[PDB]
Design a protein around this ligand. Structure first.
Ligand SMILES: [Mg+2]
Ligand SMILES: [Mg+2]
Ligand SMILES: [Mg+2]
Ligand SMILES: [Mg+2]
Ligand SMILES: [Mg+2]
Ligand SMILES: [Mg+2]
Ligand SMILES: [Mg+2]
Ligand SMILES: [Mg+2]
Ligand SMILES: [Mg+2]
Ligand SMILES: [Mg+2]
Lengths: 176, 141, 70, 136, 38, 94
RNA sequence: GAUGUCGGCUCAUCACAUCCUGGGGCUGAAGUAGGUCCCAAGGGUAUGGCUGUUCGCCAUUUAAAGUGGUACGCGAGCUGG
RNA sequence: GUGAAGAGGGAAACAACCCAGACCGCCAGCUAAGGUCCCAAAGUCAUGGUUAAGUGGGAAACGAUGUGGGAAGGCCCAGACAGCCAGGAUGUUGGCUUAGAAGCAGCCAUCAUUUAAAGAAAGCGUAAUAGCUCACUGGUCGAGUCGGCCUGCGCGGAAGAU
């Protein structure tokens, strides 16, 4: 039509497996599974994978799109190693890591330590930068925000941990 | 579109330079050496028409050193001299402050030629006519 | 999305309300609740409900009649 | 304030109040705005609508009006029952589904008609025009 | 502000106005400006 | 030229007609000349798109009824009060 | 062949269209304080002067002194202005 | 027309509404209105289609890329719709104005070149320039894509006191 999804290679490391519905993948990165919906019928010839809609039911066809993509990311994650980094701006704001507990000195009375789930560590190349990186893109996303969420940037200044991309310059001029 | 430090442009008088407001801080921020350029610019500007505002593009290097190309004076300015007028019309096209012969425009087109893209003289002449019509300067053939 | 609604008795407009996904303390209750009302309503159908035996955990304490079954 | 009606002589009086039946169709401009469904088109309603057409647009061409109120609508204060039949003062047109807008110079025909359709109590389609061809 | 009924959407860059019925004119991609469901 | 297919009517009255247009088949007529008036049942959602033109009420038309010919023109046109829909159509024979 | 009026006292019970406190969105939101809208009924939600008053105005408090239903809640419970 | 002066069955309950006029008795049949999963008598009936909100099982203006159907149109395998890559130039910082106004405070003008394309410029931004994004175009990918017309069912609008 103008959209769909058909490709999903299985290079080295890509040790995909299906158990009726379940799909466990392996590789240089980690062990990620993701039992899709029920109708789902994914397989694997030698390289291309393919979702399986029990039939052309409304909530059954589109269920393919969201699927042929999720697994694909599982592959793109396991082979590349996912990264995403945010930056902290504002006086006093600092950064630090000690394995998991990424101590955070933002601007409250006492600093904190966000313990990241397993599969994604983080590194502060400086007291200003934090670069998280792991396999599963899921835990990646939530923790990406779960972190910046500790202090969302405010317009008047911009201060507050922001994704290292956020267009938000600053405010609309103040007033009263 | 896009606007970054390094390779600055400015239109400075023929034989005059160094004032802070006009020059100084402008390129001074970039790391240019005010004095050297002042004397350097006005040196060649002697040969180039004195009394004629001439735009120059200075390009600085990591060295903080720099070079600059002196081109031909602005079309608007040239049209002013040609017209014998000091200023534009304020409300161009509504009120004409001056006039210039078609011959003159060819002469200005010829002067600016180096800086203009014009494939042929007619093209050049007309790029300048465009400026004249923006200046409230009529052209009589 | 579906409550059951009981209302105790001691007013104070307490009026208890619990959803289904909220049925984690005693799943046995439901079903027995549903199967009710569909009875003659009164004495006969009242002492007729117990012939169900709740049980929420498959083959467990089948002692309710461990001896014979079908 | 406007008043499409009033402006009649004083006699003849007022009374009655019936129901309705079918509509009607006119033709005077390049674009018309017809309504669909009985309702009460009071003088105030009609002025509000029409007056809202120019609404800082343009005085271009000229708008019309096929609709025209016939007052005879009595109301009573905080008083007893059927002690008379208090004055009226209110308005009412009593349309069905007639055409009543019409536009002179094209310009923004359909556009404006919509920019001022809510003032009316009834629902009116975009309608089209005096015709012997169509649209789309 | 976040309205109750529906005030259309206006502007251009406003949200696709798609979701669980969220109108509110504003035009997102206005770092500060953000008139919407609330 | 415009070509409108059609056929004679079964009946002709309240119930009858009302039942045709209720299925995209507004009943029309065709008179003029020595030939007895013709009562047909054209296809609504197929003629309203053809009347869409200004040519429709100028140049003669060809109604394919039964399988014969006629070559006529449009006279009166009965359209719905508020629905873009169309109704009874008068046809002036040649 | 009788369903006792207003206000007060006593003692209440519910609604939510929320006054305070709790959580949010926008702001012509720097902060502090506000404006408005969403959510929210757990709990809390003034003493007096004048008047029969309800209410109201006034003095002084308070986080605040909510709107409303309950025969304009409440006389086989009090009062009788 | 019914009740009054009418019983029986139906609308949960319900003089008037729907069915229907009770001479008695019957552990015998067929029907009306209305119904057939349990309370509760009888299809968990069949052939097809809609809905996904418990709509059915309360309520308007108006609002919305919900989802069903029918007809007509706009661009497009000389390549469209979304995206990715690349460019977006010259006179010129247009004239005036202004401390400055260089596409982007404001007023006027808004031409012309070079072109595959390139507004004297759509927003952000600078003290003003620098810089960022936009209109437009080339390459990529290769089939639909973008709205209205008429209609089905549905959603929001939707706050109350034991
Ligand atoms: Mg019973
Ligand atoms: Mg509320
Ligand atoms: Mg008091
Ligand atoms: Mg009372
Ligand atoms: Mg007593
Ligand atoms: Mg007394
Ligand atoms: Mg009697
Ligand atoms: Mg039978
Ligand atoms: Mg049964
Ligand atoms: Mg319901």
């Amino acid at each position: 039509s103008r959209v769909a999804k058909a490709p999903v290679v299985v290079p080295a490391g890509v040790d995909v497996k299906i158990n009726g519905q379940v799909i466990t993948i392996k590789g240089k990165n980690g062990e990620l599974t993701r039992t899709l919906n029920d109708a789902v019928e994914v397989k694997h010839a030698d390289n291309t994978l393919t979702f399986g809609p029990r039939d052309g039911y409304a909530d059954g066809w589109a269920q393919a799109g969201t699927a042929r993509a999720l697994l694909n990311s599982m592959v793109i994650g396991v082979t590349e190693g996912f990264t995403k980094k945010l930056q902290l701006v504002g006086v006093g704001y600092r950064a630090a890591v000690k394995g998991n507990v990424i101590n955070l000195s933002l601007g409250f009375s006492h600093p904190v330590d966000h313990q990241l789930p397993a599969g994604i560590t983080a590194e502060c190349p400086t007291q200003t930068e934090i670069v998280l990186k792991g396999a599963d893109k899921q835990v990646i996303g939530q923790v990406a925000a779960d972190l910046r969420a500790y202090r969302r940037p405010e317009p008047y200044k911009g201060k507050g941990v922001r994704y290292a991309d956020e267009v938000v310059r600053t405010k609309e001029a103040k007033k009263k | 579109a896009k606007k970054v430090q390094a390779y600055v442009k400015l239109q400075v008088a023929a034989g005059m330079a160094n004032p802070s407001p006009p020059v100084g801080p402008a390129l001074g921020q970039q790391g240019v050496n005010i004095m050297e350029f002042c004397k350097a610019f006005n040196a060649k500007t002697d040969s180039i028409e004195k009394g004629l505002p001439i735009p120059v593009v200075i390009t600085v290097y990591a060295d903080r050193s720099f070079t600059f190309v002196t081109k031909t004076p602005p079309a608007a300015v040239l049209l002013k001299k040609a017209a014998g007028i000091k200023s534009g019309s304020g409300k161009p096209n509504k009120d004409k402050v001056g006039k210039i012969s078609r011959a003159q425009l060819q002469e200005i087109a010829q002067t600016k030629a180096a800086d203009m893209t014009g494939a042929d003289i007619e093209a050049m002449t007309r790029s300048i006519e465009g400026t004249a019509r923006s200046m409230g300067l009529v052209v009589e053939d | 999305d579906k409550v059951y609604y009981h209302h105790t008795g001691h007013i104070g407009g307490i009026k208890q309300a619990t959803f289904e996904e909220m049925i984690a303390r005693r799943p046995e209750r439901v079903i027995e609740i549903a199967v009710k009302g569909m009875l003659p309503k009164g004495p006969l159908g009242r002492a007729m409900f117990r012939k169900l035996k709740v049980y929420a955990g498959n083959e467990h304490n089948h002692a309710a009649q461990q001896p014979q079954v079908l | 304030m406007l008043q499409p009606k009033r402006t009649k002589f004083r006699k003849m009086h007022k009374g009655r109040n019936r129901g309705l039946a079918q509509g009607t169709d006119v033709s005077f401009g390049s674009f018309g705005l017809k309504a669909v469904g009985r309702g009460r088109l009071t003088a105030r309603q009609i002025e509000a609508a029409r007056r809202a057409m120019t609404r800082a647009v343009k005085r271009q061409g000229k708008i019309w009006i096929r609709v025209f109120p016939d007052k005879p609508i009595t109301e009573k204060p905080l008083a007893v029952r059927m002690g008379k039949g208090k004055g009226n003062v209110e308005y009412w047109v009593a349309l069905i589904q007639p055409g009543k807008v019409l536009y002179e110079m094209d310009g923004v025909p359909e556009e404006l008609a919509r920019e001022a359709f809510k003032l009316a109590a009834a629902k009116l389609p975009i309608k089209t025009t005096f015709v012997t061809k169509t649209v789309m | 502000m976040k309205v109750r009924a529906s005030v259309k959407k206006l502007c251009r860059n406003c949200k696709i106005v798609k979701r669980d019925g969220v109108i509110r004119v504003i035009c997102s991609a206005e770092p500060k400006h953000k008139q919407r469901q609330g | 030229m415009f070509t409108i297919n059609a056929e004679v009517r079964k009946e002709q009255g309240k119930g009858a007609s009302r039942r045709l247009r209720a299925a995209n088949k507004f009943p029309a007529i065709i008179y003029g000349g020595k030939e007895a008036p013709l009562a047909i049942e054209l296809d609504h959602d197929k003629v309203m798109n053809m009347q869409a033109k200004a040519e429709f009420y100028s140049e003669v038309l060809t109604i394919v009824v039964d399988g014969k010919e006629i070559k006529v023109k449009a006279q009166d046109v009965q359209r719905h009060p508020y629905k873009p829909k169309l109704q009874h159509i008068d046809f002036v024979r040649a």
